[model samples]
Target: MPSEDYAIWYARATIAALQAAEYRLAMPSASYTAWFTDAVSDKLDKISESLNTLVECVIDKRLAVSVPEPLPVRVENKVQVEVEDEVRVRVENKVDVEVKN
Candidate 1:
């Protein structure tokens, strides 16, 4: 798939997984909630693993497409760390954003 298509697919899958998680959390019964939470957590973990695989695939493609250069691995590490931090920050920001919306 093209990069844009892959991105859209990834986003849709992520959203669906998250919605499932939210639905699980919204169950009224305590026992159901506990079971749902565990199920959702497991599903989310799988989703995360899939995303990591996707990132590795993209990185491999980038390496193949880019010109040969002494690309420092540390740069990729830093970028990954920054991206994780930014995602966390955005998740926190979503509370206010959703309220405003």
Candidate 2:
């Protein structure tokens, strides 16, 4: 059974949110997922900063953070998109726009 503590829940959320962004940002082509409650907006450079902040809240003494820096659930890569062109590619610098012919 999961705990009903607010601190634990929020800390856990930060983990999940940052993890998802980090994964998509790392890949050659991917889409980022937004936080469930929109706690933090999406930005390309969002992960490292939030990763630190969320950890802070998690280990605020309310929740027993055993791992030092608690990581949220493993970021799930759930986005799948099909490109009309088999030679689909997007320039590395582009943010949300995908160039498909």
Candidate 3:
């Protein structure tokens, strides 16, 4: 009887079976199959990166947990920085003198 452990073992065994047959990422473009489409291919392309990261995490549990390490620190004993300052001033004064005849 196929049980939980059997299913998990079968999953890994099936993957190994593909490896035994020299599995490849190459897929036939001219082949007619509902399994793959242009949009689906693009989605899988985006997903494969995340999938690889997940696999890496699973393969290396240490990747999920890291020891704290102190990073290098830089102290500026004497630092001179140059900056440019632009100041603009606008003054408008209007004086009107009217003579009454």
Question: Number of the top candidate by lDDT?
Answer: 3
Candidate 3 weakest ten by summed lDDT:
30-39
- Tens-digit per-residue lDDT, 1-101, candidate 3: 78999999999999989888964666565653344655487688879988997778764455575554785678869878675877586758875879898
lDDT of candidate model 2 versus the reference: 0.64
How should the candidates be ordered by TM-score, best one leading? 1, 3, 2
Which lDDT values do the candidates have, in the order given?
Answer: 0.70, 0.64, 0.74
TM of each candidate vs. truth: 0.26, 0.18, 0.24
Candidate scoring better on TM-score of 1 and 2? 1
By lDDT, the candidates rank as: 3, 1, 2
lDDT of 1 by residue, 13-100 (tens): 9999988874434537988778977889778988999988767756635732555587654543434333434343334343433455
RMSD of 1: 38.4
Compare candidates 2 and 3 on TM-score and give the better one. 3
| Model 1 ranges off by over 4 Å | 1-30, 60-101
Give candidate 2's error at residue 31 in angstroms.
31
Clashes of each: 0, 0, 0
Mind giving the per-residue lDDT tens digits that candidate 2 earns over 19-58? 8784434433323334422444545348868787766765
Best candidate (score: TM-score): 1
What lDDT would candidate 1 get against the real structure? 0.70
Decide which is better by lDDT, 1 or 3.
3
